[PDB]
Symmetry: D2
């Protein structure tokens, strides 16, 4: 199960470069030169890297250091063939963003957040990114009175509309993807789930420029079914990007490598992405645990891609299995895909078989045969099939 | 804290009428005649009742029993002045709905679900309901392969569009509200949160006919901030109805009386509903615990309204407190309400105070004063103020 | 992966016999004659059945019906070779237990609960059960004032001590196992986790007569690591019995078939049970989903045993893998098993290599190599190894 | 509601001294001199401070800097009258503890952890601490194979037994308290709940030297009822210490000030502590949110004590209310405190009123009147009474 750049696996600089500082511990690893990470990730079979502006250009760099850093990075991209499909802004690390970026109560911080973002959009376009991700990790509150949510949504809409105006006025061909997270580092974060972000996009001035970048661990921190949420995003035509990792239930954001955490959900996710023809990057946003040295970092990063490829195999085997296709018909997955009432309202109303002469007890008695279907999915996942 | 019909408190027949059957226990209470519940609820200060078709008309009733039941109910409404602002369909109790109603895999069940619903819409209009609620409690799955979610969303859209066609073709003045629930009785339920339902409505043929009916306990079963979700629904203009109860964290749907469960959240919810001018019914969907006899049932139902009125008082006191308004300005809630960039994109770009000459360290050093504001909210809630 | 009676797989009568009534739905299946379940389970490879008194003898049966029911059951056991390793009392279904059995506030109910239990202990001994399970499903509260927990623990200790006196005075060779559950059907249940039950047993008069019967789904309803809890029970010498099923995170008690839910946890559990030499019954407490007809019921029950056997295989392969044993040494699992200070306190104090001359920075720099070890566990689980 | 030193309110140096570094953000506050915190906390009405060795003495200090730091601290304690009732060891910040202290896989780290602890025990005794707290925050695992839990419990028992030997051999009058936490910073932490720690203590060589130090937010991170767990610890005679803060459900450890989070639970906790006569320190382990400047830090710390005192008032009012005492008798809290069977086993067996002639239907029909009792508890909490 060896990854190729055609698998579109991408990594953030901040993932393998995480020094292992957590709320209760100091770094267990020295910092990684982005040039060294680009080269190590290319050797592992990755297709591309992503970056926050602050990952690449240390905060407060002069314009001459800034261009020196870009030029070094650009050399590493050119030496390796690595792409940069996605860029994002760090609006969460610096103390100035402690109440958020786009929805900070302080207006001058909101304007600074927009300028910091716009600067990096120019740079992202320059580096060829086609998706610009926005993770409002500091947008939210620990207490109810700290944030009027309707005002914050106004400010959030205003920020995203202005970003959309700037993109179309520059004639840039780049789209935005909102990354939801229900909590941490804020007590509650605005647009907490895929659903909340999808609803929000429909109120923007140019909705067609915005989609979602859902993350496995984030929806699972709310106990939600991450495959279900992805299906709805696809149904809406709004899955612009996706973040893969693992999470062991409702607790702090663990950012385990993909496939760790809820293994059955990872299987159903890959089944959905592959069967829907999702063609975006397969992005890993994970943290090698701080127990690990650099050898463990690359091992964890390899395991990300490996577990995707294994699950991709098992899902395809499951869908191609004639006994599964038989069981799918046994549970009437075929009838689920048919229109309830293509004959239209009036025909439905006059159809006495739909109500007056419907045998309710016969229909109730029919088994759905879901457990046999699920055990076949299990057998396939486990390679007992 | 005595409720009046002007408080628009409403109860489902199924709430006070719950016999106390749970997954592990038999009924602890005899069944309630709906006529007796209408009369008891009117004596408690309720404004109205709601019903599932099956609450009012026993399943499979002849057309003559059906009209006898309506006529008895109509007499109780006329004798008490109770209104019926909202009606809904039971698409979950009968075994025939075990895989759902609108998204059942079986097409004939889907058509039956639509006819069962349409019949009750006629009856709801007759009884004067202005909101028709849809809770897809059986729509979903315990296993990943049982339901193609994109197909189910198609079938769900199709059902709701047809309902919208039937309403507009009949010239009915009634709107629909989708009630989300993340799980139980299904392992995962479709449209699991307020966000997911809001996004879904934007894809219907006549979006203006559909809103949400969020329920406290349901969003909290996903660990979400229920006040935040309500704010987004209001921001969208889609809060058509609301269900009030209590819930002690992420576990089974407890349907505790309102104010039980997360007390601080109940306070912030009432603060939001009152300050936004929400004018719909204050509907209680709760279950008097099965430890209780009928005296405990009415006691629990009284406590629902009482806790709303107490919290309504404390929220208003909080918002009217000049020291709170001062603290709100101290945490820049006023600046949050101002446009980030009413001067427009180009002016923002040329504004060197927004970036080139922005003192990031000065802005970072400013405290948000959120903890003092929250302790004032606490003092008010507790009547220590 | 075919089960044999030597695998010690056991099922409750109430598991396959669940009619599919849930909080929101009526039965979807007719009731099962216990004699028919005993015969069907024997054909599936089960080793034994368990029962609540009320599963076997309908509540309130005359002494002549009671013995007729036992005699019919005894015939089915004799015709099939099925054993009854475990029996338990239903102290939760009848409305009289709505506030509990052993810790009901009403004393006459507590005495009735003890007599109901003692009667069934006699019957369990007669049928040869060696473990008597107690699941205090109604012991607890929805509200804080309803139950003084210290008093309830007194009443719980008193009940269990008296049960222990009755057993030793009758010269019965039977032991008790407490089954913890954190919630549902009560808002919070007493002795909510394995830990709470283990602590409680140490205060009983004859602690040696009592152990725990942990259940997968129950500890996971608290987000706990079920393998970890089982290890502690084993460490204490108190794992008398175990209940296997599946659960998808913190929500209502799903009682999915074993292997569904958290698949990686099921793998680590089987690894622990097998490597510790657990020799008790492998008991399945699960509910075939109500979507299923009787064919789906037996399919689900077969899947229980199958998933255990598959996981048992993969765990053994993992532990026997020399590259795993190498990786285990690489992460110092061997050093974890050695005494920290077998040289004793004074030697440790005088050992300057333990502190004064300990190279803290060298030790910190060592990687734990946990991620490589976990990916090997993953590969084995997935049959990619 | 002004605190006095007789209220026994204590704070960790690390609480008010938290610089606001979280997983996603840099410090928002400069470091606090412990001498300045001791003085500020004394002005707020605190009774005492607690410390990790590393809070007080910077890691790796010479013996001359070490005594200079103690001497400065000792001067601040002497100038203010502040006590040090509890001390603890930092076995979690330094990278060397990344796999734990007492249960690190590496033996030399385990010995170093014991020496680091023993050194601070001497210092704690010198400063007069009577409780030594152990929070095994790094003891546990992110993956199943990384830690054999039975071995780790052996190593944990060994460490605590040796600590007990050292204490009794030195003739120190100090006791140990284990602080449980279910997760974070490890994926799962050993001894995850109060129950797990209580069970563990019963296997130590000198159990009488060890109790628990439970923390509000920690048990709530597992969805458990923190008042219930405290009652069991009291019942066991093992509540040696307690940590107070707030937590909004199952998510990352928020360390909100006490009274924030689950307000009703905080009320029931104070009711229990006061009615049981708990006489230990009321210790706050919380973090002023990083949105706050130093003014917000002291405001948050004041709010801790204030919310305890308010709740203490409301609980006492509730218990002294004759209508509550009446309602308590109505729900048979009095009968719960009586022995089920003080007449003994044989008398119970011969008592036909306990079974043969017990009217089960009469007893079932009795209401528990729990909802009226809970609404009275609510009214008292809210000051609507
Ligand atoms: Mg994450
Ligand atoms: Mg991400
Ligand atoms: Mg509900
Ligand atoms: Mg509802
Ligand atoms: Mg269960
Ligand atoms: Mg069980
Ligand atoms: Mg904490
Ligand atoms: Mg603590």
């Amino acid at each position: 199960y060896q990854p190729t750049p055609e698998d579109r696996f991408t990594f953030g600089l901040w993932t393998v470069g995480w020094q292992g500082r957590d709320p209760f511990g100091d770094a267990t690893r020295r910092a990684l030169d982005p040039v060294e990470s680009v080269r190590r990730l290319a050797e592992l079979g990755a297709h591309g890297v992503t970056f926050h502006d602050d990952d690449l250009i240390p905060f407060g760099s002069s314009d001459s250091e800034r261009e020196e850093h870009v030029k070094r990075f650009r050399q590493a991209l050119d030496d390796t063939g690595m792409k940069v499909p996605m860029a994002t802004t760090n609006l969460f690390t610096h103390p100035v963003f402690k109440d958020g970026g786009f929805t900070a109560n302080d207006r001058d911080v909101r304007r600074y957040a927009l300028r910091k973002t716009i600067r990096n959009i120019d740079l992202a376009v320059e580096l060829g990114a086609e998706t610009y991700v926005a993770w409002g990790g500091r947008e939210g509150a620990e207490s109810g009175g700290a944030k009027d949510v309707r005002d914050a949504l106004d400010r959030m809409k205003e920020a995203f509309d202005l970003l959309g105006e700037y993109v179309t006025s520059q004639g840039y061909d780049i789209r935005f993807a909102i990354e939801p997270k229900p909590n941490e580092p804020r007590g509650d974060i605005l647009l907490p789930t895929v659903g909340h972000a999808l609803a929000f996009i429909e109120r923007l001035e140019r909705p067609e420029l915005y989609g979602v970048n859902p993350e496995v661990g984030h929806e699972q921190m709310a106990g939600l079914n991450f495959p279900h949420g992805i299906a709805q995003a696809l149904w809406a035509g709004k899955l612009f990007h996706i973040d893969l990792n693992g999470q062991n239930g409702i607790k702090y954001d663990q950012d385990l490598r993909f496939g760790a955490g809820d293994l059955r959900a990872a299987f159903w996710l890959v089944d959905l992405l592959e069967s829907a023809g999702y063609s975006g990057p397969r992005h890993f946003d994970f943290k090698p645990p701080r127990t690990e040295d650099f050898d463990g970092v690359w091992a964890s990063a390899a395991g990300c891609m490996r577990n995707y490829l294994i699950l991709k195999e098992r899902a395809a085997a499951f869908r191609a299995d004639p006994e599964v296709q038989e069981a799918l018909r046994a549970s009437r997955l075929d009838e689920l895909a048919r229109p309830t009432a293509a004959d239209g309202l009036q025909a439905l109303l006059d159809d006495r078989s739909a109500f007056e002469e419907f045998d309710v007890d016969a229909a109730a008695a029919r088994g759905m045969a879901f457990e046999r279907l699920d055990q076949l999915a299990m057998d396939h996942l486990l390679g007992a099939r």
